[PDB]
Short mmCIF file of C-alpha atoms in Angstrom, two decimals:
data_model
loop_
_atom_site.label_atom_id
_atom_site.label_comp_id
_atom_site.label_asym_id
_atom_site.label_seq_id
_atom_site.Cartn_x
_atom_site.Cartn_y
_atom_site.Cartn_z
CA UNK A 24 -0.43 -28.23 -17.76
CA UNK A 25 3.38 -27.92 -18.26
CA UNK A 26 4.69 -24.51 -17.01
CA UNK A 27 5.78 -21.75 -19.43
CA UNK A 28 9.01 -21.01 -17.53
CA UNK A 29 10.99 -21.37 -14.30
CA UNK A 30 12.32 -18.07 -12.91
CA UNK A 31 15.49 -18.98 -10.99
CA UNK A 32 16.22 -15.42 -9.76
CA UNK A 33 14.76 -11.98 -9.19
CA UNK A 34 16.97 -9.06 -8.13
CA UNK A 35 15.69 -5.61 -7.19
CA UNK A 36 18.10 -2.72 -6.46
CA UNK A 37 16.94 0.70 -5.25
CA UNK A 38 19.19 3.62 -6.29
CA UNK A 39 17.55 6.85 -5.10
CA UNK A 40 19.56 10.08 -4.91
CA UNK A 41 18.08 11.18 -1.56
CA UNK A 42 19.53 8.24 0.43
CA UNK A 43 22.94 8.40 -1.29
CA UNK A 44 23.18 12.15 -0.52
CA UNK A 45 22.05 11.78 3.12
CA UNK A 46 23.92 8.87 4.81
CA UNK A 47 22.64 7.87 8.27
CA UNK A 48 24.28 8.79 11.57
CA UNK A 49 24.20 5.92 14.13
CA UNK A 50 20.97 7.22 15.76
CA UNK A 51 19.04 8.05 12.58
CA UNK A 52 16.54 6.26 10.28
CA UNK A 53 14.88 6.95 6.93
CA UNK A 54 11.30 8.17 6.62
CA UNK A 55 9.14 6.75 4.85
CA UNK A 56 9.60 3.56 6.92
CA UNK A 57 7.73 1.62 4.22
CA UNK A 58 8.87 2.56 0.72
CA UNK A 59 6.57 1.94 -2.25
CA UNK A 60 2.79 1.47 -2.27
CA UNK A 61 1.84 1.21 1.41
CA UNK A 62 -0.98 3.80 1.79
CA UNK A 63 -3.47 4.61 4.54
CA UNK A 64 -1.27 3.34 7.43
CA UNK A 65 -2.99 2.15 10.60
CA UNK A 66 -1.24 1.09 13.80
CA UNK A 67 -2.11 -0.48 17.14
CA UNK A 68 -0.27 -1.73 20.24
CA UNK A 69 -0.58 -4.75 22.54
CA UNK A 70 2.02 -4.74 25.35
CA UNK A 71 5.53 -4.56 23.85
CA UNK A 72 4.22 -5.37 20.34
CA UNK A 73 3.21 -2.95 17.55
CA UNK A 74 1.23 -3.94 14.44
CA UNK A 75 0.96 -1.81 11.30
CA UNK A 76 -1.22 -2.33 8.21
CA UNK A 77 -1.90 -0.72 4.81
CA UNK A 78 -4.46 -0.56 1.97
CA UNK A 79 -3.77 -2.73 -1.09
CA UNK A 80 -6.66 -2.36 -3.58
CA UNK A 81 -6.65 -5.23 -6.17
CA UNK A 82 -3.43 -6.94 -5.04
CA UNK A 83 -3.61 -10.40 -3.45
CA UNK A 84 -2.98 -11.16 -0.70
CA UNK A 85 -4.25 -7.83 0.63
CA UNK A 86 -3.46 -5.65 3.67
CA UNK A 87 0.20 -6.43 4.55
CA UNK A 88 0.84 -6.53 8.30
CA UNK A 89 4.15 -5.53 9.96
CA UNK A 90 5.31 -6.24 13.54
CA UNK A 91 7.85 -4.23 15.60
CA UNK A 92 8.88 -3.75 19.25
CA UNK A 93 10.62 -0.40 18.60
CA UNK A 94 8.69 1.28 15.64
CA UNK A 95 11.86 1.38 13.44
CA UNK A 96 12.69 -2.28 12.79
CA UNK A 97 9.71 -4.02 11.17
CA UNK A 98 9.10 -7.64 10.16
CA UNK A 99 6.24 -8.44 7.75
CA UNK A 100 4.35 -11.25 9.54
CA UNK A 101 1.97 -11.76 6.62
CA UNK A 102 -1.07 -10.23 4.93
CA UNK A 103 -4.33 -10.01 6.92
CA UNK A 104 -6.61 -10.86 3.96
CA UNK A 105 -4.85 -13.94 2.54
CA UNK A 106 -7.75 -16.35 1.86
CA UNK A 107 -10.15 -16.12 -1.10
CA UNK A 108 -13.00 -16.30 1.46
CA UNK A 109 -11.81 -12.91 2.80
CA UNK A 110 -10.96 -11.32 -0.57
CA UNK A 111 -11.62 -12.49 -4.14
CA UNK A 112 -10.50 -9.71 -6.53
CA UNK A 113 -10.96 -11.70 -9.81
CA UNK A 114 -12.67 -8.73 -11.56
CA UNK A 115 -11.73 -5.91 -9.14
CA UNK A 116 -11.03 -2.46 -10.56
CA UNK A 117 -7.42 -1.30 -10.17
CA UNK A 118 -8.56 1.58 -7.92
CA UNK A 119 -11.21 -0.43 -6.04
CA UNK A 120 -10.74 -3.45 -3.72
CA UNK A 121 -9.28 -2.84 -0.24
CA UNK A 122 -9.45 0.83 0.84
CA UNK A 123 -8.01 2.41 4.05
CA UNK A 124 -7.47 -0.21 6.79
CA UNK A 125 -7.88 0.42 10.54
CA UNK A 126 -6.29 -2.14 12.92
CA UNK A 127 -7.10 -2.14 16.66
CA UNK A 128 -6.48 -4.07 19.85
CA UNK A 129 -9.33 -4.36 22.33
CA UNK A 130 -7.71 -4.86 25.74
CA UNK A 131 -11.13 -5.49 27.34
CA UNK A 132 -11.69 -8.71 25.32
CA UNK A 133 -8.02 -9.31 24.36
CA UNK A 134 -9.00 -9.34 20.65
CA UNK A 135 -7.62 -7.83 17.45
CA UNK A 136 -9.77 -6.16 14.74
CA UNK A 137 -8.97 -5.31 11.12
CA UNK A 138 -11.77 -3.14 9.70
CA UNK A 139 -11.95 -1.79 6.12
CA UNK A 140 -14.04 -1.23 2.96
CA UNK A 141 -13.78 -4.02 0.37
CA UNK A 142 -15.05 -2.72 -3.01
CA UNK A 143 -15.00 -6.17 -4.62
CA UNK A 144 -16.14 -9.73 -3.76
CA UNK A 145 -17.00 -11.28 -1.41
CA UNK A 146 -18.13 -8.24 0.67
CA UNK A 147 -18.59 -5.28 -1.68
CA UNK A 148 -18.46 -2.85 1.25
CA UNK A 149 -17.56 -2.21 4.88
CA UNK A 150 -16.35 -5.27 6.78
CA UNK A 151 -14.27 -6.39 9.76
CA UNK A 152 -12.04 -9.43 10.49
CA UNK A 153 -10.83 -10.63 13.91
CA UNK A 154 -8.09 -12.65 15.62
CA UNK A 155 -6.57 -13.48 19.01
CA UNK A 156 -3.05 -13.63 17.48
CA UNK A 157 -2.05 -12.16 14.06
CA UNK A 158 0.53 -14.96 13.60
CA UNK A 159 -2.35 -17.48 13.31
CA UNK A 160 -4.28 -15.42 10.71
CA UNK A 161 -7.71 -13.77 10.82
CA UNK A 162 -11.40 -14.77 10.62
CA UNK A 163 -13.66 -14.54 7.58
CA UNK A 164 -15.32 -11.10 7.15
CA UNK A 165 -18.27 -9.75 9.17
CA UNK A 166 -20.31 -7.60 6.75
CA UNK A 167 -21.15 -4.21 8.31
CA UNK A 168 -24.35 -2.33 7.42
CA UNK A 169 -23.28 1.26 6.64
CA UNK A 170 -21.98 3.10 3.57
CA UNK A 171 -18.97 5.32 2.92
CA UNK A 172 -15.32 4.49 3.65
CA UNK A 173 -12.57 4.58 6.31
CA UNK A 174 -14.26 2.60 9.13
CA UNK A 175 -12.54 2.63 12.54
CA UNK A 176 -13.56 1.15 15.90
CA UNK A 177 -13.02 2.57 19.40
CA UNK A 178 -13.51 0.71 22.70
CA UNK A 179 -14.54 2.94 25.64
CA UNK A 180 -14.04 2.28 29.41
CA UNK A 181 -17.69 1.31 30.17
CA UNK A 182 -17.91 -1.77 27.93
CA UNK A 183 -19.41 0.29 25.10
CA UNK A 184 -17.88 0.10 21.62
CA UNK A 185 -18.20 2.60 18.79
CA UNK A 186 -17.51 2.83 15.08
CA UNK A 187 -16.68 5.98 13.15
CA UNK A 188 -16.54 6.36 9.38
CA UNK A 189 -16.71 8.77 6.45
CA UNK A 190 -20.09 9.10 4.70
CA UNK A 191 -21.95 11.24 2.15
CA UNK A 192 -24.27 13.98 3.54
CA UNK A 193 -28.06 13.89 3.03
CA UNK A 194 -27.89 17.48 1.70
CA UNK A 195 -24.63 18.19 -0.25
CA UNK A 196 -23.71 21.89 0.15
CA UNK A 197 -20.80 22.05 -2.37
CA UNK A 198 -20.77 18.94 -4.55
CA UNK A 199 -19.29 15.44 -4.03
CA UNK A 200 -16.31 16.82 -1.99
CA UNK A 201 -18.70 17.57 0.86
CA UNK A 202 -18.40 14.58 3.21
CA UNK A 203 -19.21 13.69 6.82
CA UNK A 204 -17.88 11.85 9.82
CA UNK A 205 -20.50 9.54 11.31
CA UNK A 206 -20.37 7.54 14.54
CA UNK A 207 -22.29 4.39 15.56
CA UNK A 208 -22.52 2.35 18.74
CA UNK A 209 -21.10 -1.13 18.02
CA UNK A 210 -22.37 -4.49 19.25
CA UNK A 211 -19.40 -6.65 20.29
CA UNK A 212 -21.44 -9.87 20.46
CA UNK A 213 -22.94 -9.48 16.96
CA UNK A 214 -20.07 -7.50 15.34
CA UNK A 215 -22.56 -5.06 13.81
CA UNK A 216 -23.60 -1.42 14.34
CA UNK A 217 -26.72 -0.80 16.46
CA UNK A 218 -29.51 0.73 14.28
CA UNK A 219 -30.67 4.18 15.46
CA UNK A 220 -27.35 5.04 17.16
CA UNK A 221 -25.87 6.87 14.16
CA UNK A 222 -24.99 10.57 14.44
CA UNK A 223 -23.04 13.00 12.26
CA UNK A 224 -20.22 14.33 14.49
CA UNK A 225 -18.37 16.33 11.82
CA UNK A 226 -19.98 17.93 8.78
CA UNK A 227 -17.57 18.83 5.96
CA UNK A 228 -14.42 19.46 8.05
CA UNK A 229 -12.83 21.87 10.57
CA UNK A 230 -14.60 24.85 8.92
CA UNK A 231 -17.50 24.14 6.51
CA UNK A 232 -17.46 27.70 5.08
CA UNK A 233 -14.08 26.78 3.47
CA UNK A 234 -15.68 23.80 1.61
CA UNK A 235 -13.31 21.17 3.12
CA UNK A 236 -12.64 18.34 0.66
CA UNK A 237 -13.26 14.68 1.61
CA UNK A 238 -12.89 14.63 5.39
CA UNK A 239 -12.05 11.00 6.10
CA UNK A 240 -9.72 8.56 7.91
CA UNK A 241 -11.51 9.23 11.27
CA UNK A 242 -9.90 7.82 14.45
CA UNK A 243 -11.12 8.14 18.05
CA UNK A 244 -8.68 8.25 20.97
CA UNK A 245 -9.45 8.96 24.62
CA UNK A 246 -6.92 10.72 26.85
CA UNK A 247 -7.39 12.27 30.35
CA UNK A 248 -11.15 11.73 30.10
CA UNK A 249 -11.44 13.67 26.80
CA UNK A 250 -12.42 12.18 23.40
CA UNK A 251 -10.35 12.99 20.31
CA UNK A 252 -11.32 12.67 16.66
CA UNK A 253 -8.46 12.82 14.17
CA UNK A 254 -9.28 12.95 10.45
CA UNK A 255 -7.64 13.43 7.08
CA UNK A 256 -8.96 16.51 5.21
CA UNK A 257 -8.40 17.94 1.71
CA UNK A 258 -8.18 14.73 -0.36
CA UNK A 259 -5.36 12.21 -0.77
CA UNK A 260 -3.67 14.49 -3.35
CA UNK A 261 -2.27 18.06 -3.31
CA UNK A 262 -4.39 19.39 -0.43
CA UNK A 263 -3.90 16.42 1.95
CA UNK A 264 -3.64 17.18 5.68
CA UNK A 265 -4.64 15.90 9.11
CA UNK A 266 -6.90 17.79 11.49
CA UNK A 267 -7.93 17.22 15.12
CA UNK A 268 -11.17 17.65 17.12
CA UNK A 269 -12.03 17.06 20.79
CA UNK A 270 -15.20 16.42 22.85
CA UNK A 271 -16.30 15.77 26.45
CA UNK A 272 -18.54 12.87 25.32
CA UNK A 273 -18.31 10.11 22.68
CA UNK A 274 -21.26 11.63 20.74
CA UNK A 275 -20.62 15.03 22.32
CA UNK A 276 -20.01 18.10 20.10
CA UNK A 277 -16.55 17.74 18.52
CA UNK A 278 -14.78 21.11 18.20
CA UNK A 279 -11.63 21.66 16.06
CA UNK A 280 -8.42 22.91 17.69
CA UNK A 281 -8.02 26.50 16.52
CA UNK A 282 -4.59 25.21 15.40
CA UNK A 283 -5.41 23.17 12.33
CA UNK A 284 -4.19 21.40 10.37
CA UNK A 285 -1.56 19.56 12.49
CA UNK A 286 0.10 17.70 9.55
CA UNK A 287 0.50 18.86 5.92
CA UNK A 288 2.92 19.67 3.10
CA UNK A 289 0.33 21.37 0.88
CA UNK A 290 1.66 24.95 1.16
CA UNK A 291 5.00 24.01 -0.54
CA UNK A 292 5.73 24.07 -4.34
CA UNK A 293 9.53 23.88 -4.49
CA UNK A 298 10.96 15.93 -1.34
CA UNK A 299 7.56 14.70 -0.09
CA UNK A 300 3.91 15.61 -0.72
CA UNK A 301 0.24 14.63 -0.10
CA UNK A 302 0.76 14.22 3.65
CA UNK A 303 -2.22 12.97 5.65
CA UNK A 304 -4.33 9.97 6.71
CA UNK A 305 -2.51 9.48 10.01
CA UNK A 306 -2.95 7.21 12.99
CA UNK A 307 -1.40 7.60 16.48
CA UNK A 308 0.12 5.08 18.89
CA UNK A 309 1.63 5.33 22.39
CA UNK A 315 3.56 9.09 20.93
CA UNK A 316 4.33 8.38 17.23
CA UNK A 317 2.17 9.11 14.16
CA UNK A 318 2.32 7.11 10.90
CA UNK A 319 0.86 8.70 7.73
CA UNK A 320 0.92 8.58 3.94
CA UNK A 321 2.83 10.68 1.46
CA UNK A 322 4.38 10.59 -1.98
CA UNK A 323 7.98 11.28 -3.06
CA UNK A 324 7.48 12.70 -6.62
CA UNK A 325 10.14 12.80 -9.38
CA UNK A 326 11.54 15.95 -11.04
CA UNK A 327 8.36 16.26 -13.20
CA UNK A 328 5.99 15.78 -10.23
CA UNK A 329 5.02 12.21 -11.19
CA UNK A 330 4.71 9.31 -8.73
CA UNK A 331 5.48 5.72 -9.75
CA UNK A 332 6.12 4.73 -6.13
CA UNK A 333 2.55 5.09 -4.87
CA UNK A 334 1.68 6.51 -1.45
CA UNK A 335 4.14 5.44 1.26
CA UNK A 336 3.95 5.01 5.05
CA UNK A 337 5.87 7.87 6.70
CA UNK A 338 6.43 8.34 10.45
CA UNK A 339 6.99 11.32 12.81
CA UNK A 340 7.27 11.72 16.62
CA UNK A 341 4.13 13.15 18.29
CA UNK A 342 4.15 15.37 21.38
CA UNK A 343 0.94 14.88 23.38
CA UNK A 344 2.04 16.35 26.73
CA UNK A 345 -0.75 18.96 26.44
CA UNK A 346 -4.43 19.10 25.38
CA UNK A 347 -3.66 18.44 21.68
CA UNK A 348 -1.30 16.20 19.62
CA UNK A 349 1.51 17.96 17.74
CA UNK A 350 3.29 16.16 14.87
CA UNK A 351 6.96 17.13 15.46
CA UNK A 352 7.84 19.19 12.31
CA UNK A 353 4.60 18.00 10.63
CA UNK A 354 4.13 21.51 9.24
CA UNK A 355 7.64 22.23 7.84
CA UNK A 356 9.14 20.47 4.74
CA UNK A 357 9.88 16.85 5.65
CA UNK A 358 13.38 15.46 5.52
CA UNK A 359 14.37 11.88 4.80
CA UNK A 360 16.15 11.56 8.19
CA UNK A 361 14.55 11.42 11.62
CA UNK A 362 16.25 10.70 14.94
CA UNK A 363 15.32 7.19 16.22
CA UNK A 364 13.94 6.63 19.76
CA UNK A 365 16.60 6.50 22.56
CA UNK A 366 18.44 3.15 22.75
CA UNK A 367 17.12 1.77 19.41
CA UNK A 368 19.63 0.80 16.68
CA UNK A 369 18.88 0.72 12.92
CA UNK A 370 18.59 -2.92 11.77
CA UNK A 371 16.55 -2.12 8.63
CA UNK A 372 17.47 -4.58 5.87
CA UNK A 373 19.45 -6.62 8.40
CA UNK A 374 18.29 -10.09 9.58
CA UNK A 375 14.61 -10.63 8.77
CA UNK A 376 13.79 -6.92 9.06
CA UNK A 377 12.08 -4.99 6.29
CA UNK A 378 14.58 -2.92 4.21
CA UNK A 379 14.88 0.85 3.75
CA UNK A 380 17.20 3.36 2.07
CA UNK A 381 19.00 1.94 -0.98
CA UNK A 382 19.40 -1.83 -0.98
CA UNK A 383 19.33 -4.98 -3.10
CA UNK A 384 16.83 -7.82 -2.74
CA UNK A 385 17.90 -10.99 -4.53
CA UNK A 386 15.38 -13.80 -4.29
CA UNK A 387 16.06 -17.33 -5.59
CA UNK A 388 12.67 -18.82 -4.59
CA UNK A 389 14.32 -21.93 -3.07
CA UNK A 390 11.53 -22.15 -0.45
CA UNK A 391 7.79 -22.88 -0.62
CA UNK A 392 7.24 -20.10 1.93
CA UNK A 393 7.55 -17.22 -0.54
CA UNK A 394 8.46 -13.84 0.95
CA UNK A 395 5.35 -11.79 1.92
CA UNK A 396 6.41 -8.87 -0.36
CA UNK A 397 5.35 -10.81 -3.45
CA UNK A 398 1.80 -10.14 -4.66
CA UNK A 399 -0.38 -11.23 -7.58
CA UNK A 400 -3.02 -9.11 -9.34
CA UNK A 401 -6.67 -10.10 -8.87
CA UNK A 402 -6.11 -13.63 -7.51
CA UNK A 403 -3.83 -16.02 -5.56
CA UNK A 404 -0.34 -16.99 -6.81
CA UNK A 405 -1.17 -20.56 -5.72
CA UNK A 406 -3.31 -20.87 -8.89
CA UNK A 407 -0.20 -20.58 -11.11
CA UNK A 408 3.03 -20.97 -9.06
CA UNK A 409 4.87 -24.02 -7.72
CA UNK A 410 8.37 -24.25 -6.25
CA UNK A 411 10.70 -26.54 -8.21
CA UNK A 412 12.49 -29.46 -6.53
CA UNK A 413 15.78 -27.58 -7.15
CA UNK A 414 14.12 -24.18 -6.51
CA UNK A 415 12.71 -21.41 -8.70
CA UNK A 416 9.28 -20.01 -9.64
CA UNK A 417 7.65 -22.61 -11.90
CA UNK A 418 4.63 -20.69 -13.19
CA UNK A 419 1.91 -21.88 -15.57
CA UNK A 420 -0.01 -19.47 -17.82
CA UNK A 421 -3.60 -18.60 -16.90
CA UNK A 422 -6.03 -17.76 -19.73
CA UNK A 423 -5.95 -13.98 -19.27
CA UNK A 424 -3.58 -11.71 -21.16
CA UNK A 425 -2.04 -8.70 -19.39
CA UNK A 426 -4.62 -6.08 -20.50
CA UNK A 427 -7.61 -7.84 -18.90
CA UNK A 428 -9.48 -7.14 -15.67
CA UNK A 429 -8.89 -10.78 -14.68
CA UNK A 430 -6.31 -12.74 -12.61
CA UNK A 431 -2.97 -12.94 -14.51
CA UNK A 432 -0.07 -15.37 -13.98
CA UNK A 433 2.51 -12.87 -12.74
CA UNK A 434 4.30 -12.26 -9.39
CA UNK A 435 5.00 -8.66 -8.48
CA UNK A 436 7.24 -6.55 -6.25
CA UNK A 437 6.29 -2.95 -5.46
CA UNK A 438 8.37 -0.19 -7.03
CA UNK A 439 9.96 1.15 -3.82
CA UNK A 440 12.14 3.79 -5.50
CA UNK A 441 12.02 6.39 -8.27
CA UNK A 442 15.39 5.11 -9.52
CA UNK A 443 15.77 1.33 -9.65
CA UNK A 444 17.36 -1.53 -11.57
CA UNK A 445 15.97 -5.05 -11.61
CA UNK A 446 16.61 -8.30 -13.39
CA UNK A 447 15.19 -11.83 -13.59
CA UNK A 448 16.70 -15.09 -14.82
CA UNK A 449 14.50 -17.75 -16.38
CA UNK A 450 14.66 -21.18 -17.98
CA UNK A 451 12.14 -21.00 -20.80
CA UNK A 452 10.24 -24.23 -21.45
CA UNK A 453 10.60 -24.68 -25.27
CA UNK A 454 7.93 -27.40 -25.24
CA UNK A 455 5.13 -25.20 -23.86
CA UNK A 456 6.17 -22.48 -26.38
CA UNK A 457 4.27 -19.85 -24.32
CA UNK A 458 5.36 -16.32 -23.30
CA UNK A 459 7.59 -15.68 -20.26
CA UNK A 460 9.20 -12.44 -19.15
CA UNK A 461 9.55 -9.28 -17.11
CA UNK A 462 6.83 -6.73 -16.36
CA UNK A 463 6.54 -3.12 -15.18
CA UNK A 464 2.85 -2.64 -14.26
CA UNK A 465 0.71 0.32 -13.14
CA UNK A 466 -2.58 -1.11 -14.43
CA UNK A 467 -3.85 -3.57 -17.06
CA UNK A 468 -3.61 -0.80 -19.73
CA UNK A 469 -0.53 0.98 -18.33
CA UNK A 470 2.34 -1.49 -18.49
CA UNK A 471 5.63 -2.47 -20.14
CA UNK A 472 6.33 -6.14 -20.90
CA UNK A 473 9.42 -7.95 -22.26
CA UNK A 474 8.83 -11.62 -23.07
CA UNK A 475 10.66 -14.52 -24.70
CA UNK A 476 8.30 -16.13 -27.22
CA UNK A 477 8.50 -18.84 -29.91
CA UNK A 478 8.16 -18.51 -33.71
CA UNK A 479 9.03 -21.66 -35.67
CA UNK A 480 11.54 -23.71 -33.66
CA UNK A 481 13.14 -20.46 -32.56
CA UNK A 482 12.75 -18.05 -29.65
CA UNK A 483 12.32 -14.28 -29.98
CA UNK A 484 12.23 -11.37 -27.55
CA UNK A 485 9.28 -8.99 -27.70
CA UNK A 486 8.94 -5.64 -25.93
CA UNK A 487 5.36 -4.35 -25.70
CA UNK A 488 3.70 -1.29 -24.20
CA UNK A 489 0.04 -0.59 -23.42
CA UNK A 490 -0.76 3.05 -22.62
CA UNK A 491 -4.13 4.39 -21.30
CA UNK A 492 -4.43 7.83 -19.60
CA UNK A 493 -7.12 8.35 -16.91
CA UNK A 494 -9.98 9.71 -19.00
CA UNK A 495 -9.54 7.58 -22.16
CA UNK A 496 -11.55 4.39 -22.82
CA UNK A 497 -9.63 2.95 -25.76
CA UNK A 498 -6.17 1.37 -25.63
CA UNK A 499 -3.99 -0.77 -27.88
CA UNK A 500 -0.94 -2.92 -27.14
CA UNK A 501 2.00 -1.93 -29.37
CA UNK A 502 5.24 -3.77 -30.10
CA UNK A 503 8.01 -1.32 -29.14
CA UNK A 504 10.86 -3.65 -30.17
CA UNK A 505 11.57 -7.25 -31.25
CA UNK A 506 14.80 -9.28 -31.73
CA UNK A 507 15.46 -13.00 -32.45
CA UNK A 508 17.75 -14.93 -30.07
CA UNK A 509 18.04 -18.27 -31.91
CA UNK A 510 17.23 -21.56 -30.21
CA UNK A 511 17.31 -20.88 -26.47
CA UNK A 512 19.42 -23.78 -25.07
CA UNK A 513 20.45 -21.93 -21.86
CA UNK A 514 18.78 -19.74 -19.17
CA UNK A 515 18.27 -16.07 -20.10
CA UNK A 516 18.33 -12.93 -17.95
CA UNK A 517 15.98 -10.00 -18.57
CA UNK A 518 16.58 -6.58 -17.04
CA UNK A 519 14.99 -3.16 -16.70
CA UNK A 520 16.41 0.06 -15.26
CA UNK A 521 14.74 3.42 -14.64
CA UNK A 522 16.48 6.75 -14.01
CA UNK A 523 13.17 8.26 -12.80
CA UNK A 524 12.40 9.69 -16.26
CA UNK A 525 12.46 6.57 -18.53
CA UNK A 526 12.56 2.77 -18.35
CA UNK A 527 15.18 0.93 -20.44
CA UNK A 528 14.85 -2.81 -21.00
CA UNK A 529 17.66 -5.26 -21.79
CA UNK A 530 18.47 -8.94 -22.09
CA UNK A 531 21.67 -10.83 -21.27
CA UNK A 532 22.34 -14.06 -23.13
CA UNK A 533 25.58 -16.05 -23.76
CA UNK A 534 27.73 -13.58 -21.81
CA UNK A 535 26.76 -10.19 -23.20
CA UNK A 536 24.12 -7.58 -22.23
CA UNK A 537 22.19 -5.64 -24.91
CA UNK A 538 19.51 -2.96 -24.72
CA UNK A 539 16.19 -3.83 -26.41
CA UNK A 540 13.96 -0.87 -27.24
CA UNK A 541 14.82 2.72 -26.35
CA UNK A 542 13.84 4.82 -23.28
CA UNK A 543 10.14 4.31 -22.39
CA UNK A 544 8.42 7.29 -20.70
CA UNK A 545 8.18 6.68 -16.94
CA UNK A 546 5.09 8.94 -16.68
CA UNK A 547 2.97 6.12 -18.24
CA UNK A 548 3.24 4.12 -14.95
CA UNK A 549 2.42 7.09 -12.71
CA UNK A 550 -0.72 7.65 -10.68
CA UNK A 551 -0.66 11.12 -12.30
CA UNK A 552 -1.10 9.68 -15.80
CA UNK A 553 -3.26 6.56 -15.23
CA UNK A 554 -5.22 7.70 -12.17
CA UNK A 555 -5.90 5.35 -9.29
CA UNK A 556 -4.64 4.75 -5.77
CA UNK A 557 -1.62 2.49 -6.49
CA UNK A 558 2.11 2.48 -7.19
CA UNK A 559 3.89 0.72 -10.06
CA UNK A 560 5.00 -2.90 -9.76
CA UNK A 561 7.86 -4.93 -11.21
CA UNK A 562 7.76 -8.68 -11.60
CA UNK A 563 7.85 -11.80 -13.75
CA UNK A 564 4.90 -13.34 -15.61
CA UNK A 565 3.68 -15.83 -18.20
CA UNK A 566 1.02 -15.48 -20.93
CA UNK A 567 -0.69 -17.15 -23.93
#
């Protein structure tokens, strides 16, 4: 009972060099189209409407879904897994939960499909959800009976349905990196694979002699009577790429185009990296990549990039998918750039100021390991009234904090809060990679006085032990007015501050940005910034 604080504002301002140095011409747009942690992009089309989805791991709700009629201007229409009956990540590992999504539209039964691997409750494995209309939400999961990751359905022209996925081989030839692409016939009535219909269609990759790492993200397309299998190969790090196979039959032998890969950045050590895990739509191909900082670290996670695809011949070509990517791409003829305008998703450098004056909270806001509904209410006059759950920040448990993805290497953010002196709890501002890789600045109480406390918790990949340390601490007397907390990062360090009766002061010094990188902490996620409450 009684909330710890009411956050009356959050402001997030992206300030990346690349966008400032490369202003848009009227017919241009920035790529990545989704900045920040939006990995493993999957895309489908029904009529004039495009739908695009991403992996989300332990965040809730999971799998954000974007709609667009032109592939440049996107509106987030929600998150596909938004009920606890679909996804309950209470004790989910930071690099578990929802892996690569694959969305599809079956024109034969006018039905949508979101299929993924859910490495947490309720499913603990491969599963699919369905809908007639994404705006109405999706069904509860159908548990699918096969292992591995990166499931993806394909609906042929004879009423037969298939399912392709990554799997482990019976006989590993070169360690755990040896993987397989497996296909199954799919039963539309039962929403389950047909036992005995499984076949390995790719073993290892395009050339097994080369020991191809983690062939995955398989997608089937059919064009001019020919079947096409497109896969990611080389791992979602330094050796990422996309490769392409074709066959005369759904099960038929799949042969790699002599020209492979068709999408990579891996042969450069000099903007963007780790390019792969693509999906095509009629052509345009969306994929994942990272924009690392000057030291090679990534606090922004893997982002959804786009490129035009020429498929006028036998094989798909990613236009400039094999030369160093640039931030600017020409838009399709006739389309104008409305990114950040109206209700469209932003891009480039921008400012998002949210006052939370509406019970329909913007779909960009996520909680870790549980629903925000368990600890947030909208005040009569507006603002995030949030009550402290039992868990502290370092726990693999749901925590009472609302988060915004770090969409830029260089950013500045602030929040304004009215701190309930009666509840005496902790309320503040958080930069979060994982439960043991975070920076937290909180107002707290000691006596009948408030204090500000800056804490770090640092845990590199391979280390078991961690310990929360107080970086800095300052008294602020008896808080009788709202207070603003702020953090800014220049890509190298994070600097916290607070702004009370007029004046803005730094608290603590520069805090190493590397601590919140994938590189340092491991995992599959980008850093987050948000507000939270504890004790």
